[PDB]
Amino acid sequence: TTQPALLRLSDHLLANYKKGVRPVRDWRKPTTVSIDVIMYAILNVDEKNQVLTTYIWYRQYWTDEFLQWTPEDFDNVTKLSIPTDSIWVPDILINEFVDVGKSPNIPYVYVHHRGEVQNYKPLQLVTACSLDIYNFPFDVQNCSLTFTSWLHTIQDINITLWRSPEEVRSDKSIFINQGEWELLEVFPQFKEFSIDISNSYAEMKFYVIIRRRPLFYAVSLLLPSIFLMVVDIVGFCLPPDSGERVSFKITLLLGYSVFLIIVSDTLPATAIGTPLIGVYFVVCMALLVISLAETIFIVRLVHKQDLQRPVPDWLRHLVLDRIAWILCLLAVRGLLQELSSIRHFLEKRDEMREVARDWLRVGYVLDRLLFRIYLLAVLAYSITLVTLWSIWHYS
Amino acid sequence: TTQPALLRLSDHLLANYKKGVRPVRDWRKPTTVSIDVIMYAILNVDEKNQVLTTYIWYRQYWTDEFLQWTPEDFDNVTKLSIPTDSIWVPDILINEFVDVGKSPNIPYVYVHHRGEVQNYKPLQLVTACSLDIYNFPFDVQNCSLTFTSWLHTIQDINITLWRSPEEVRSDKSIFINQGEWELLEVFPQFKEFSIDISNSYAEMKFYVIIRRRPLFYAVSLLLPSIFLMVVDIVGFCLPPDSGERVSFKITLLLGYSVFLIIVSDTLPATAIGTPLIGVYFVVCMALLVISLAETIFIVRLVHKQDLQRPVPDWLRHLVLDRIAWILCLLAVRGLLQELSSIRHFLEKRDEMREVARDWLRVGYVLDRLLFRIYLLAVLAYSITLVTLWSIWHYS
Amino acid sequence: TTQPALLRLSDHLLANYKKGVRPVRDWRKPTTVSIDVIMYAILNVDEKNQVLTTYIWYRQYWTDEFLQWTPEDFDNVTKLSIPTDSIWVPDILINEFVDVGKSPNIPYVYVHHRGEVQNYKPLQLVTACSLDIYNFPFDVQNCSLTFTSWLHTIQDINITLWRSPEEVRSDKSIFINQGEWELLEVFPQFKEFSIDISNSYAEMKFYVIIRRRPLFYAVSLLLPSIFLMVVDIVGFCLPPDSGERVSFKITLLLGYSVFLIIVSDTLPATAIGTPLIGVYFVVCMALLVISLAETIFIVRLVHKQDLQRPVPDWLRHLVLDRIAWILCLLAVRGLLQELSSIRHFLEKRDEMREVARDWLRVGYVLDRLLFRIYLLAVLAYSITLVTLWSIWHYS
Amino acid sequence: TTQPALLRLSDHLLANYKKGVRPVRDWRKPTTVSIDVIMYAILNVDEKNQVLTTYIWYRQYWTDEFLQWTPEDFDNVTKLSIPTDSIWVPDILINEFVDVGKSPNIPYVYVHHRGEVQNYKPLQLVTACSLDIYNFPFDVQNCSLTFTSWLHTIQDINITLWRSPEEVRSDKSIFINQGEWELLEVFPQFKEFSIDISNSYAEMKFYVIIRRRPLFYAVSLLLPSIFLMVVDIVGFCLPPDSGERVSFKITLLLGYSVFLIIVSDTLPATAIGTPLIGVYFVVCMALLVISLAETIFIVRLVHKQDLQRPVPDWLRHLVLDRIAWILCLLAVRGLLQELSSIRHFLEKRDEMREVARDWLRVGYVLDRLLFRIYLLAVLAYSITLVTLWSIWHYS
Amino acid sequence: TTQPALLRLSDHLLANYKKGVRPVRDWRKPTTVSIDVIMYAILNVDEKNQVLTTYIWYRQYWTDEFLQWTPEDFDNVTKLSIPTDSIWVPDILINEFVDVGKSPNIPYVYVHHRGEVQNYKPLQLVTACSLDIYNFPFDVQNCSLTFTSWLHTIQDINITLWRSPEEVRSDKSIFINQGEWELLEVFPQFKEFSIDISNSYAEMKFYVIIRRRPLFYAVSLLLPSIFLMVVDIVGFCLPPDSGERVSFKITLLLGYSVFLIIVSDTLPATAIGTPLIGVYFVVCMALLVISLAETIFIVRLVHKQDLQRPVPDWLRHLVLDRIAWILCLLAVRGLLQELSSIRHFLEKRDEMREVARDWLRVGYVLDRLLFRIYLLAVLAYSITLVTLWSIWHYS
Ligand SMILES: O=C1c2cccc3[nH]nc(c23)CCN1[C@@H]1CN2CCC1CC2
Ligand SMILES: O=C1c2cccc3[nH]nc(c23)CCN1[C@@H]1CN2CCC1CC2
Ligand SMILES: O=C1c2cccc3[nH]nc(c23)CCN1[C@@H]1CN2CCC1CC2
């Protein structure tokens, strides 16, 4: 024969090739497909829908017993490229699919002179994963991707690994960083699946373990809270009888309610329930309500409503004791009868204002004591909250 | 003949096979397709659009009378794989479709040596369902999926079940949990459908009964309400004549209105109307309006506007009776003529302030009585609201 | 010949069949297609985009003169199924398309022994419609769907109806209810269309008349309005000189503005303009502004600013007349010289407070009169608003 | 020969037809395609993305030199229908594409007996346009659609017009109105395009000029502004020393800020910058700030802080002049020594209150003058704003 | 032979052409593809998803050794058009793909008489890019697009440039401006890629450098801030003892909080953290908190709570020194015994009011000093903020 080019080899491979039959000379021998995957980027994590969208570079190889030739008599050709849609291709899919991703089509494969067939392709995966958000800013997710043949049983198609699992799990080569998620590892494991007894299938499960970067949410959830706490603290400097303390506190409570309502949408709460962030927000709500109740009580105490005399049973241990326990602080007759009324009226006015002064002093002492108690409680809460981050970070 | 491989069997099956003709030797015998379905995950429930999106694993089998062979003379081959697009396939669809889902294509099927043809595929279903949200947090939905042939009548295609309905309905093997919906059951039923008389079709209806998990909405709808109720309760501690009580109440009402407006979007209301949650919110609105009206009335009562003498007809039964019914509490002439004016002015001032004091006492008594009544009403409402959850949960 | 099966009939129909030529023996005879449609569900009505999305079950039939056979010599076969993509199919589309819907493909059709060819398919339609929202909660929409051949003129393809128009228009058999829209009717009409003179086409127009259910918007637009009206009414019980009336009214106005802004997005306003709901909201705005202006005027009137004596020309007809027209309500010299100053100062203080009391009484009378007038106006407006719904509902 | 039907003509046209070669007998003659377009509906105008989405009905014709036949010997057939995918079709596209629209496929074309080939199809176009929003409510947009062959140069494919440009530009026959946009005209123009010297292409540019209907935004941007202006005007009726004027003004400013923030999203601002609507809103902001500053100044002026005597240098020209310039308005000794203190104290109290009264009168005069000035300024601004609309509308 | 037309040339090129084999006569010679790209429009920059969407016009050429002919004997034809799907086409893709864009298909290519094959097509690219937003309004982005063959190694396919890199980088000919992004340059670079040792591929990387236009965000982030600053400045004109200063300040703080919450969504914060805009906003928060604290302190100082005598140790250096350091400002006995009480009461009232006056003067002096200090600090901050823009712009 002549030597036109290598294309006649293709003819010798595809003159009478049937692409609908599994390529084995003995039907009792299963076709083994060796696969591996490299993660490229974590595209999306929908917590409320429990959906994970990722991108991978996937490659696989198997053996075709009808595509073998001698390199001699073909100008020492050892491998070539063949269109994908002209040979048998296994139907390897992922169990966890909930949608069909958009990925480009690769129309060529390699064939070697010993039946070695290799296939490279990129895949966009939209899978269903169970996400635990119990500790939302510092959660670690552990999803799974299970590769298996949808139809063929283990007697026809078996799945192995292209390379060792040790180098598969420690592989971060093309991964895209600074994208709110950090790829920890990808651990492979082989299994034999069977719902109903009579049919058994080969499955290769890749456990993808990833970790969230908390610094994205470290300023959107912390600074407004401490700002509202510090303005609450500075609000106590107003005197209780000024009259605008109650308006200040109710305005602050309204602002905090608006904040929590407008922020709770961005923090998902699914599965077992809300994360501990909701618990801490509820604690802040309780603290604000306690402060408002103390303000209401002291305003009620220092109010002027034609009060009675101050009670001695709550004066000896409230002014004297608290000073040391805590920080310290014929015509004549007509003239006299006329002037007696003026004198009596001025006396009763003076008595009323003296009673008001005593009640004001009692209220001031109580306000100072409650301010000190609230300040100590706030400091203790801040310390016991920051110690958790301190012990978590040093790990 | 020689023995190249099993592929010649495929040739013997596909040399002169026509895929456009229904595979029966006698045209009077219908082709029976036995199907079954396993639910995988509930993807979405759009209440306002009345749309249900689910994922299922579907499989079916039928008999092809032109794909039969003897296992002998073919190296004892009992079954093989054939491309799907080379044989006749029934057109089984779902009546309730409103859109086309994205599902992967399976290019292979099994064929056994007796004409047995089996087909496995995953399906994403976007169907139309009637959703009842009368009891929104605890609703149970009952949707239907009807499998039928779109064209062929019962004289051509008939539908049966692969396995017993008892094991079909009690099947939760691959279902994905912690996704806001719990799969209760899937009940199958066969029916003969016919709009117009002359044409009758076979239908297999699967009733999918699912239940919503209420704990997702148990913290987003309850804690703010009780928080606003408790701050309303603590707001009554302010004296009526302080002046900031009205501002406090109107600010609280504005906050509650903002809350209800910003939350009502997340609670759908369709079909028959709003759920009972709207009724309970309206009840809370009425309670808040009653509290505001009581505050306005008492502020009007205790106001100083140069009032008249206190009425005896509303004093004997308001102070004395309420104490026991409810909880208890030549130059001379010129000098006299001059001083008489001062005495009279001080007398009239004292009379005015005494009248004001009496009115203030009456207002305080009324405020205490209304506070007790409102507290009892709130307690009764809370008890009669929690008893419904108590009786519902223990079931 | 032998009798393998009916499939040879298919061969006899498809041995030398050309699917690119119109199936008529005489080219002067047009091909008549008889069609009909059953609505299934109204999917979406985008008012701002003027788009209607619906789902229909469509079927059609025509005559193929190259697909005729004798039932004898073919085992008395009268009809069979043929793949759709192997025969000629008319290009019937809808003029009003603005997008391509996603509908499943039906790969089979019936053929009878006289050339009768029937085709069933479901269609998702996304069309452009002119929507009138002049009376938004009670609007009735009248859209059109025009079926016609895109290329062939009336000399090639003509369109008729499968069944009588009377049974077409009175057909609600598979329609999905409780979906915010009620299907009133579907009226068909035939027409001959022609933009430019030389080309005339056959068109079949289905007028789809549907009606909106108002109860969906009967609680989202009515209860907050009446709630704000009733709190406005109860706000008048505050005395004009209390000082928090103005703050109450401005807070109520701010809340109403927030409500209208946050609700106007959900009410579309397109085409000719806003519905009458905007007019009624503007009327409510005017009423609230009138109430605020009355409050401002009365507060200005009852204020203490060292006023002059009360005017007699606005006292005789303001207190006396209004009572019946409306509801009723050597050293000596030094001592005298010294005491004269005190007497004069007390006299001028008493005169000032008497003037203030008179002005307060005038303000109270005016406030009562304006309150009665506003209450009557509100009652009249409510009656004349509810009478429209009363006369509309009983129809 | 016999006379089966016209289909043999199709055979005579498609026995040895090659659809991959340009249909010319001489390769030096370009293939001329005559096209035209009718707009159907303006679907979307994304200003921030600078994207225009439209729907058109497009048709074209050219000459195929291998599809000619004699009407005689073919039963006087002059034209017929041929599948689109069996003949050569030019690749005419639009330069401005940024996405692929979804349009139905038309599988048939006409062929006449002289090689005339005509093609009708609907097209959904998603193109990139430069939008100028300098005058946002009354802007006129001028977009372009350029039809050209993507590959073939002017030596192969040339583009002309099916009909005269005069009847093309004055064509509003199927356009959908009441959709926020009015189609003004569609002007065609031919051009020869060439980036790099060696290659020249034929282009047909259609300038689509459209106009926005302002009445859609005439109620969403005007009524709230005039409402806030009129409530600002009525807010001046409060006396300066009442105390709630400042709260009223700050609440109004907060409401206006909320309005502008919640509305500015719906008004896009791209390219050269914000439209004049932002300038007018800034003017309203400046007016409100001026009003607030005047209120703050007058409240500071009329406040009681133990002031000094009123200044004569700012009293002669402030009360007297403004009235005409603007609108007008042994024991004895002890007794005397004792009473002298009371007399002196009452004298100093009277002096203080007289000083306060004088300052209050000065503040009232200044408040009236500033109110008149602000009213005149508001009237002038309203007139000079409405005159622009008056002169624009009458054009 | 005869001369029908040029189409026989196509036959001579496609009689026995195999499109699945790489077109080289010697398999050891790689196929070189020369490519180039012209950017058309920047479609989208998703910062939170780190996604870049662009549109390009791409063209490439290579050599096909089986598509060569002599121009003579073919009527001097030098080049022609061939369908794309009938010849070998290299699989050149982009590494950074995360999705599949929608671009039109071009069904024709040129072939010259020396095997020259050219291919033109438009491409919509959705790629993953690392975006740095450290200086958000003035950021410059530097993305990469890497063209390479997905399967073939450098022994089969090699990539070069169609034209010189100098004219590639300085090419802005069809780019669409006024779209929030300015194209700075496109720099090409060749590289040899290899993850694992044994396989090496050719890559052509285009670095696309673009710049954001800040004027889009120059009015949405600056004018409200300066407006709130100027109203804060004018709020200091209120006297400290007026009573509405605290309400004014808390309302302003609530408005600023609402502004920052409603604006922070439109400013993304990803990767390394928030831009300096957040730092400047935090600085504004600190300034507002300082102003509020000063107001609270001065209101506490000037309040009347039955204070003690003014302290001399904080009066000599607070009134005298500050004036120069800063800007300046038997029966008888009964009658005497009776009148002594009145005299003493008036004396103590006068002493109390004198003490209040002294404290008010001290508070006024402190308020003026703090106002001057705050004004100077605000001016310094404004100058040191505007100097950065001044030095950045002149570059
Ligand atoms: O589809 C079904 C399935 C559906 C409906 C009923 C079923 N019974 N038993 C099974 C099955 C077997 C499970 N799979 C899958 C098919 N391949 C891919 C994943 C599963 C295992 C192998
Ligand atoms: O499409 C139609 C249909 C359309 C338009 C008019 C019609 N009259 N009678 C019918 C029908 C029969 C009902 N189906 C369906 C076709 N298969 C799937 C579901 C239905 C029953 C069998
Ligand atoms: O797909 C893989 C790939 C996947 C899974 C495992 C892998 N090991 N080594 C590689 C690879 C080689 C890298 N590419 C790509 C294939 N072409 C386009 C881009 C890369 C280089 C050449």
List CB contacts (< 8 A) between B156 and chain C: 81
Q: Are residues E258 and E131 in the same domain?
A: no
Q: Angle, nearest 10°, between helix axes B245-264 and C245-264? A: 10
Listed in sequence order, the residues at least 6 apart from A99 whose beta carbon sits closer than 8 Å to its beta carbon are A126, B102, B124
Q: Are residues B232 and B144 in the same domain?
A: no
DSSP E329-371: --HHHHHHHHHHHHHHHHHHHHHHHHHHHHHHHHHHHHHHHHH
Residue A1 lies in a domain: no
Name the CA radius of gyration of chain E, rounded: 40
> What is the Cα–Cα distance from E57 to E37, expressed in whole angstroms?
6
Q: Which of E10, E42, E283, E317 is nearest to E176 (CA)?
A: E42
> What is the Cα–Cα distance from E219 to E212, expressed in whole angstroms?
15
Q: Whose CA is nearest to atom 15 of ligand 2?
A: B150
Q: Whose CA is nearest to atom 14 of ligand 1?
A: B57
> What is the Cα–Cα distance from C2 to C75, expressed in whole angstroms?
12
Q: Are residues B198 and B252 in the same domain?
A: no
**Which of C183, C214, C245 is the last residue in one of the domains?**
C214
> What is the Cα–Cα distance from D377 to D288, expressed in whole angstroms?
12
Two tokens, residue A188: 């492979």
Q: Are residues B206 and B228 in the same domain?
A: no
Which residue is listed with tokens 């000065």?
Answer: D362
Q: Is the CB of residue A241 less than 8 Å from the CB of residue B147?
A: no
Q: Which of B137, B141, B159, B132 is nearest to B42 (CA)?
A: B141
Greatest alpha-carbon pair distance for chain D in Å reads 163
Q: Are residues D151 and D290 in the same domain?
A: no
SS3 D194: coil
Q: Which technique was the structure solved with, according to the deposited record?
A: cryo-EM
Closest-lying ligand 2 atom to the alpha carbon of residue B153: 22
Residue D251 to residue C246, Cβ atoms within 8 A: no
Q: Calculate how far, in angstroms, residue B183's C-alpha sits from the geometric centre of ligand 1.
A: 19
> What is the Cα–Cα distance from B18 to C5, expressed in whole angstroms?
12
Residue A239 to residue E264, Cβ atoms within 8 A: no
Q: Are residues E70 and E204 in the same domain?
A: yes
Q: Calculate how far, in angstroms, residue C159's C-alpha sits from the geometric centre of ligand 2.
A: 20
Which of E86, E151, E346 to substitute to test the interface with A, most A CBs within 10 Å? E151
> What is the Cα–Cα distance from E303 to E240, expressed in whole angstroms?
9
Judge if the beta carbon of residue B93 lies within 6 A of ligand 2. no
Of all helices (H) and strands (E), which one includes residue D181? strand D181-193
Residue E1 lies in a domain: no
Residue C237 to residue B339, Cβ atoms within 8 A: no
Amino acid at A100: V
Q: How far is CA A348 from CA A355, B304, D369, E198, in A?
A: 11, 21, 48, 106
Residue D45 lies in a domain: yes
Report the b/e string of B147-174 with b at 16+ CB within 10 A.
Answer: bbbbbbbbebbbbeeeeeeeebeebeee
> What is the Cα–Cα distance from E46 to E25, expressed in whole angstroms?
47
Q: Are residues E122 and E79 in the same domain?
A: yes
DSSP C203-266: EEEEEEEEEE-GGGGTTTSSHHHHHHHHHHHHHTTS-TTSS-HHHHHHHHHHHHHHHHHHHHTT
Q: Which of C269, C138, C281, C265 is nearest to C214 (CA)?
A: C138
Closest-lying ligand 2 atom to the alpha carbon of residue B93: 18
Listed in sequence order, the residues at least 6 apart from B176 whose beta carbon sits closer than 8 Å to its beta carbon are A50, A128, A130, B40, B41, B42
Q: Are residues B59 and B186 in the same domain?
A: yes
Q: Is the CB of residue D47 less than 8 Å from the CB of residue D6?
A: no
> What is the Cα–Cα distance from B311 to A61, expressed in whole angstroms?
102
Two tokens, residue B382: 């809370």
DSSP label of C97: B
**Which of B213, B235, B260 is the last residue in one of the domains?**
B213
Closest-lying ligand 1 atom to the alpha carbon of residue B121: 1
Residue B289 to residue C224, Cβ atoms within 8 A: no
Beta strand spans in chain E (E): 31-46, 51-68, 79-83, 92-94, 108-112, 114-128, 140-149, 157-161, 181-193, 201-212
Residue E341 lies in a domain: yes
Residue C101 lies in a domain: yes
Name the CA radius of gyration of chain A, rounded: 40
Q: Which of E250, E231, E355, E238 is nearest to E292 (CA)?
A: E250
Two tokens, residue D318: 């402030």
Two tokens, residue E213: 């236009």
Two tokens, residue B350: 């004292």
> What is the Cα–Cα distance from C82 to C110, expressed in whole angstroms?
6
Residue C372 lies in a domain: yes
Chain B adjacent subunits, 3+ CB pairs under 8 A: A, C
Two tokens, residue A184: 């920890």
Listed in sequence order, the residues at least 6 apart from B160 whose beta carbon sits closer than 8 Å to its beta carbon are B32, B33, B34, B35, B190, B204
Torsion of CA A300, A304, A307, A313, to 10 degrees: 50
List CB contacts (< 8 A) between E258 and chain D: 258, 261
Number of domains in chain A: 2
Amino acid at D287: L
> What is the Cα–Cα distance from D115 to D71, expressed in whole angstroms?
12
SS3 D71: coil
The angle subtended at Cα C337 by Cα C335 and Cα C341, nearest 5°, is 115
SS3 A32: strand
CATH of residue B179's domain is 2.70.170.10
Residue B1 lies in a domain: no
Listed in sequence order, the residues at least 6 apart from C162 whose beta carbon sits closer than 8 Å to its beta carbon are C34, C35, C36, C59, C60, C61
**Which of C154, C185, C214 is the last residue in one of the domains?**
C214
Of all helices (H) and strands (E), which one includes residue B323? helix B321-325
Q: Are residues B103 and B238 in the same domain?
A: no
Q: How far is CA A78 from CA B25, B360, E32, in A?
A: 51, 108, 21
Q: What values do phi and psi take at D120, rounded to 5?
A: -115, 135
Residue B97 to residue C41, Cβ atoms within 8 A: no
Tell me which of E97, E201, E203, E204 to substitute to probe ligand 3's pocket, judged by most ligand atoms within 8 Å of the beta carbon: E201
Q: Is the CB of residue A36 less than 8 Å from the CB of residue A161?
A: yes
> What is the Cα–Cα distance from C186 to C164, expressed in whole angstroms?
13
| C-alpha C231: how far from chain center | 29
Q: Residue B366: which domain range? A: 219-393
Q: Which of E189, E181, E185, E191 is nearest to E206 (CA)?
A: E189
For the stretch A367-375, contacts whose Cβ atoms lie closer than 8 Å and that sit 24 or more positions apart, written own/partner, are A367/A236, A367/A240, A367/A298, A368/A326, A368/A327, A369/A322, A369/A326, A370/A294, A370/A298, A371/A236, A372/A326, A372/A327, A374/A236, A374/A290, A374/A291, A374/A294, A375/A233
Two tokens, residue A65: 């017993």
Of all helices (H) and strands (E), which one includes residue A38? strand A31-46
Q: Give the nearest chain E residue to A234 (CA atoms).
A: E293
Residue A2 lies in a domain: no
Q: Give the nearest chain A residue to E250 (CA atoms).
A: A248
Q: Are residues E228 and E205 in the same domain?
A: no
Q: Is the CB of residue C206 less than 8 Å from the CB of residue C144?
A: yes
Q: Are residues C207 and C234 in the same domain?
A: no
Where helices occur in chain A by DSSP H, the ranges are 7-14, 165-169, 223-235, 245-264, 276-301, 321-325, 331-393
Q: Are residues B159 and B68 in the same domain?
A: yes
> What is the Cα–Cα distance from C288 to C231, expressed in whole angstroms?
12
